[PDB]
Amino acid sequence: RVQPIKLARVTKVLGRTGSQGQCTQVRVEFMDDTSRSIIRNVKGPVREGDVLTLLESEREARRL
Amino acid sequence: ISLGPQVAEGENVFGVCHIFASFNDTFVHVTDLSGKETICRVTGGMKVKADRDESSPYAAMLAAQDVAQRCKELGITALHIKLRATGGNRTKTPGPGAQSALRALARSGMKIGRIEDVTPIPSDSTRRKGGRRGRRL
Amino acid sequence: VVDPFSKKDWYDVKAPAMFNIRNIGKTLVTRTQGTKIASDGLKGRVFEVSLADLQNDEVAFRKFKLITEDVQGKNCLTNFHGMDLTRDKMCSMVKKWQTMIEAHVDVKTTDGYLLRLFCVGFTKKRNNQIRKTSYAQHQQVRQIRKKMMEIMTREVQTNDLKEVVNKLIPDSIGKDIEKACQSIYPLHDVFVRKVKMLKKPKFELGKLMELHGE
Amino acid sequence: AKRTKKVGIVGKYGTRYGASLRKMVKKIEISQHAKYTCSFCGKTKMKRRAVGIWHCGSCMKTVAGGAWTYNTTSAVTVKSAIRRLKELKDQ
Amino acid sequence: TKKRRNNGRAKKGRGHVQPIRCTNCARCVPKDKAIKKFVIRNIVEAAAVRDISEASVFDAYVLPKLYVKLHYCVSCAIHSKVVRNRSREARKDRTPPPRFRP
Amino acid sequence: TKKSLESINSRLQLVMKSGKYVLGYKQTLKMIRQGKAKLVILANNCPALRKSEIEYYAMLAKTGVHHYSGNNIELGTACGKYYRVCTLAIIDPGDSDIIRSMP
Amino acid sequence: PVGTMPEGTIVCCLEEKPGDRGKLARASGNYATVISHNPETKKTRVKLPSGSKKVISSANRAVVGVVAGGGRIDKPILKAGRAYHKYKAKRNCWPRVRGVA
Amino acid sequence: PLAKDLLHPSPEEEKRKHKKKRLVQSPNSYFMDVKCPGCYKITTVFSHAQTVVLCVGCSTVLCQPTGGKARLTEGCSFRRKQ
RNA sequence: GCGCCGCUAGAGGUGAAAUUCUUGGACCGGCGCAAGACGGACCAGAGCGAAAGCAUUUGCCAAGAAUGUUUUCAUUAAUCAAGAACGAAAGUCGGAGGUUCGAAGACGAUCAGAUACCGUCGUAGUUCCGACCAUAAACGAUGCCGACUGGCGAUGCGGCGGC
Numbered sequence A: 001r002v003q004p005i006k007l008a009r010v011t012k013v014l015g016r017t018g019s020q021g022q023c024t025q026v027r028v029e030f031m032d033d034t035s036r037s038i039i040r041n042v043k044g045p046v047r048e049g050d051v052l053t054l055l056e057s058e059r060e061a062r063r064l
Numbered sequence B: 001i002s003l004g005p006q007v008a009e010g011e012n013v014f015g016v017c018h019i020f021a022s023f024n025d026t027f028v029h030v031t032d033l034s035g036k037e038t039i040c041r042v043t044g045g046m047k048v049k050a051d052r053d054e055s056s057p058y059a060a061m062l063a064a065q066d067v068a069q070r071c072k073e074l075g076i077t078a079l080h081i082k083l084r085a086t087g088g089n090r091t092k093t094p095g096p097g098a099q100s101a102l103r104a105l106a107r108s109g110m111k112i113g114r115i116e117d118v119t120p121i122p123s124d125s126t127r128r129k130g131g132r133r134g135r136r137l
Numbered sequence C: 001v002v003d004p005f006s007k008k009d010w011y012d013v014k015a016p017a018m019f020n021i022r023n024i025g026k027t028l029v030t031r032t033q034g035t036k037i038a039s040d041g042l043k044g045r046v047f048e049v050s051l052a053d054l055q056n057d058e059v060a061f062r063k064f065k066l067i068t069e070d071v072q073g074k075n076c077l078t079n080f081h082g083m084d085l086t087r088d089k090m091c092s093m094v095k096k097w098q099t100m101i102e103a104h105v106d107v108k109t110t111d112g113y114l115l116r117l118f119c120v121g122f123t124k125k126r127n128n129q130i131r132k133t134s135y136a137q138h139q140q141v142r143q144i145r146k147k148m149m150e151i152m153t154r155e156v157q158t159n160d161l162k163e164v165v166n167k168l169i170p171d172s173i174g175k176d177i178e179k180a181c182q183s184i185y186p187l188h189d190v191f192v193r194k195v196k197m198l199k200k201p202k203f204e205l206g207k208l209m210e211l212h213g214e
Numbered sequence D: 001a002k003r004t005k006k007v008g009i010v011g012k013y014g015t016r017y018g019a020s021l022r023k024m025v026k027k028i029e030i031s032q033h034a035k036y037t038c039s040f041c042g043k044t045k046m047k048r049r050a051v052g053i054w055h056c057g058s059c060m061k062t063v064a065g066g067a068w069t070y071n072t073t074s075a076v077t078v079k080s081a082i083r084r085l086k087e088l089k090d091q
Numbered sequence E: 001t002k003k004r005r006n007n008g009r010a011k012k013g014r015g016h017v018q019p020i021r022c023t024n025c026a027r028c029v030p031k032d033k034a035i036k037k038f039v040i041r042n043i044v045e046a047a048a049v050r051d052i053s054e055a056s057v058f059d060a061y062v063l064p065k066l067y068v069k070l071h072y073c074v075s076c077a078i079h080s081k082v083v084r085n086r087s088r089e090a091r092k093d094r095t096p097p098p099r100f101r102p
Numbered sequence F: 001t002k003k004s005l006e007s008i009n010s011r012l013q014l015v016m017k018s019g020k021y022v023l024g025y026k027q028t029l030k031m032i033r034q035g036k037a038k039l040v041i042l043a044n045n046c047p048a049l050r051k052s053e054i055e056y057y058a059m060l061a062k063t064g065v066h067h068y069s070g071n072n073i074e075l076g077t078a079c080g081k082y083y084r085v086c087t088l089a090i091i092d093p094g095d096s097d098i099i100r101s102m103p
Numbered sequence G: 001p002v003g004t005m006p007e008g009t010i011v012c013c014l015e016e017k018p019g020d021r022g023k024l025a026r027a028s029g030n031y032a033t034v035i036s037h038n039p040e041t042k043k044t045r046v047k048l049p050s051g052s053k054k055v056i057s058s059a060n061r062a063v064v065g066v067v068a069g070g071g072r073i074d075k076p077i078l079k080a081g082r083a084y085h086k087y088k089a090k091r092n093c094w095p096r097v098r099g100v101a
Numbered sequence H: 001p002l003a004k005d006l007l008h009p010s011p012e013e014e015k016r017k018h019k020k021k022r023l024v025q026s027p028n029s030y031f032m033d034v035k036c037p038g039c040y041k042i043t044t045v046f047s048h049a050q051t052v053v054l055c056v057g058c059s060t061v062l063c064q065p066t067g068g069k070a071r072l073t074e075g076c077s078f079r080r081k082q
Numbered sequence I: 001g002c003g004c005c006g007c008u009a010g011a012g013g014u015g016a017a018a019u020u021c022u023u024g025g026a027c028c029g030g031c032g033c034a035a036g037a038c039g040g041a042c043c044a045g046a047g048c049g050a051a052a053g054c055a056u057u058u059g060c061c062a063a064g065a066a067u068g069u070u071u072u073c074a075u076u077a078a079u080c081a082a083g084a085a086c087g088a089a090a091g092u093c094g095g096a097g098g099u100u101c102g103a104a105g106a107c108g109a110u111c112a113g114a115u116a117c118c119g120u121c122g123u124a125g126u127u128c129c130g131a132c133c134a135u136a137a138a139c140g141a142u143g144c145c146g147a148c149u150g151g152c153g154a155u156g157c158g159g160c161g162g163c
């Protein structure tokens, strides 16, 4: 709950998802170590090499 | 003080943690080393009010938060895990409330010992509740 | 209304001195309130714990049961109750195209310790074996099943309870029937799987503290 | 000679009382009149006295077995449990 | 028309086999029709391992497995894509599908 | 209940062919008291004082006792005649090994 | 007594308070099953033939078995005569005239 | 194979068939001479025998009769005759 | 399911949902007992059986294919109207039995209308012993017996020869 809301830079664009192409898939890095990664899904145009912000760090991986 | 056994600083006391990772609900019922003394049986299905979202991963995430904020409260430190499922007659693969009720636990500063699938398994018993042609959606 | 954690006290659990690491853990129990006194509210409890947090080197897929037979203040003494394996190791060694064989025997001791000895075993694929089914014939399986219980009758009946439980930490009964079976058909994964206690002899306080000496 | 096909012992009732009753009674009524074999002298001399009592004709020994027969399944199911409790927990 | 060389089932010299029941829809099938799928899934879902292994109480800890034998009925095998409509001159094979672990 | 009664009876029904044997109580009671009896056979259905004095005489004349696990008419086909028999003594078997049996 | 016998055994003709010399489960083919001893506060419970369990004293002397004469009512009376002698040696209650008539 | 001769083949593929189905039927059996260790009488025991064979002098077992071909107790003074 | 302790307000259940269980404290964890079926993973284009059908150990029997056979008997064989035996499941009948599942039926839903798919409950029945009925997609949709006519790797039970 009480966590510092963290900026995050991406690895490669891993394609569209979300049944309409309205989500992308970016798999950010958490700014401190280069081995801590999680596969995620943001909406909006990417431009690989950006820095996006995570409201919280522990939600879900996209696999059913 | 009245909570917490007298333990050294760099060590840890063990209490097992049963995870009932089923369909329609999940339990993150924690207890002592023996299993007997119920310490905190908090449920994902109590903290969501939608009833589609009782089995949901997000409920089982915060289900692990309330028990970890209670685990460190009494004094129990490191949790062996005794993951289950619906078991026996019914399905045995865990529900949505397995990983989110286990990954959220280790992010919540809490040491883990032996995790183990301890769902019940029959030796050919208990005619299943579907009928011959089964339940049909 | 009242906070029920704070009516309790914490003990500590000690195994018998047959093992290396004695400090098992810390059960908790509420105090004496009228009839429910602070001993029989925890005598006979079962403590599931492995071996790798009870020995120094030993493998972790084997676990013991323990039963707190007496409490001497802070200490909570135990005694042997039974052994079993982890299921995910137990059905890791079950493969396709190799025949499971099994035995189950009731063997008591010289002390009043009726025990039920479960041993499984699986046939072995040799180095150069090109065919796939390394099964067995059934008259091989019958006399192999004769060999497996009849060894662990002699492993248990001839001498006392402590050398039974001192034997099977490095799987010495299991490696023993491993040694005499591969003259008939080869076996490679032999685990004395699960021991079920049935009888408890009269609860004499002696043999208990014999295990809680040095 | 074979005199009749589908009465046997209940030909004595004749044309009375029904047909699902006399098909019920001729199973019992051949049983309670039969000479069972005595398990104590090896002879076929078991004779139904008043109900419950059975009595060996020779060896003179009386057994208080079943009511329309000599070993009701309820007795043997129980007897195979009493001699199991004598070894399970040994009391 | 006859569709298959067998009659759809993997038995020849018998007359009766074990009846089992399906996983999801619980439907009774003979044991030698049903589509098995054995699952050896790493129970921690290995993305979530570098978040527990700091919190593990050892260094070299064998993370366990999970051994669940899904054996679907053939009605729910196709609907959940675990098998596929095949073609009439690529039917005749009993080869298992290739792995592609990475 | 499946494969070990061919020991006691197939040894027994061979003496029925060759060796001398006596059925009944008071044939064997003459044979047990003049020494020529060698191995009495007591069925399961003997009365418990017939069972407990032939065992007493067998202690007196130094012979063996086989308890046949079976009814005294089940020993009828084990002999091979259409009687019942609780007690028999075999006194001179031809070439069998009932002396060399389990007791 | 029903304190010594193990649970699940089959008992006829028992006492309802200790020393009563036989009261329960005494008709033909009936049996009370003892279950669930209480080690301290020594009561047991049983299972009387009406399916009602009853906590009784644990020192009720009882006889182990089942009452002979079982399966008795599994033959119809089948005529009016042999019901008259069934109820001539018991009571005088038998020709029961309906209230409506 | 239109061109096989089946009245004068090799005498070795003649062996590689059944005891029937040959050009002429003839058994795998034979009579084999056996000296038991410690006697003087040569024994003419059948090859695929069925009995516990004794000897003239050696009043002990000569062969173990079994499934296909009888098995002598000692690997003994053994020759195949005629 | 019944006890027995521990603990909290829900648990159950579905696409959602309610009937239903519950602070005379269920659900969960633990120690036990009891009763009933059924014998998972090993289990396969393997075996056995005339066919239905057969899977936890040790067990009193009795049967059989196949192979081994310089054994015996010396056409005793093949299919077979009339007629016989065995025959899943359901059904009937009697007595034990009643755990699970569940025809009927009772509700709760979704529906235009649901006497149906789904959910809780639930009788007869699923279980045994005995006495019946001879019907199945009893399918290999291929009668039994016998011979002859391609191959190739492989399989099971024997037998033979071998690094």
Ligand SMILES: [Mg+2]
Pocket: G096, G097, G098
């Ligand atoms: Mg009236």
Ligand SMILES: [Zn+2]
Pocket: D038, D039, D040, D041, D042, D043, D045, D056, D057, D058, D059, D060, D061
């Ligand atoms: Zn008699």
Ligand SMILES: [Zn+2]
Pocket: E022, E023, E024, E025, E026, E027, E072, E073, E074, E075, E076, E077
């Ligand atoms: Zn399905």
